[PDB]
Design a protein that fits this description.
Number of helices: 0
Structural class: mainly beta
Name: General secretion pathway protein C
Strand order of the largest sheet: 4-5-6-7
Helix content: under 10%
Order of helices and strands: EEEEEEE
PDB class: transport protein
Radius of gyration: 16 Å
Assembly: monomeric
Keywords: transport protein
Entry title: Solution structure of GspC-HR of typeII secretion system
CATH class of one domain: Mainly Beta
Largest sheet: 4 strands, antiparallel
Amino acid sequence: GSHMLEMAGALDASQMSNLPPSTLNLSLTGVMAGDDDSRSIAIISKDNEQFSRGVNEEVPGYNAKIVSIRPDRVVLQYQGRYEVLGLYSQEDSGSDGVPGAQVR
């Protein structure tokens, strides 16, 4: 077939994908999956500003597009690639935004 361009890769690269590609950053506090991608709420924390994202939404702050919602895992489209990012942090929530030695 030439009138239908599929090109589904060649092999399951994600089978060996134990290392989160894309970018890895943020804190994906957690999603609230909605049927699946048919809705999907993504409560992501960006230096701890939680937003409601989802499939075909992008992560707060950076254009990491949530092409697939999972609890705190997201197959996201960033940098022309959509890979498996479980953006997770606690260093974002544990900060006032003032880089120093003695904030407290």
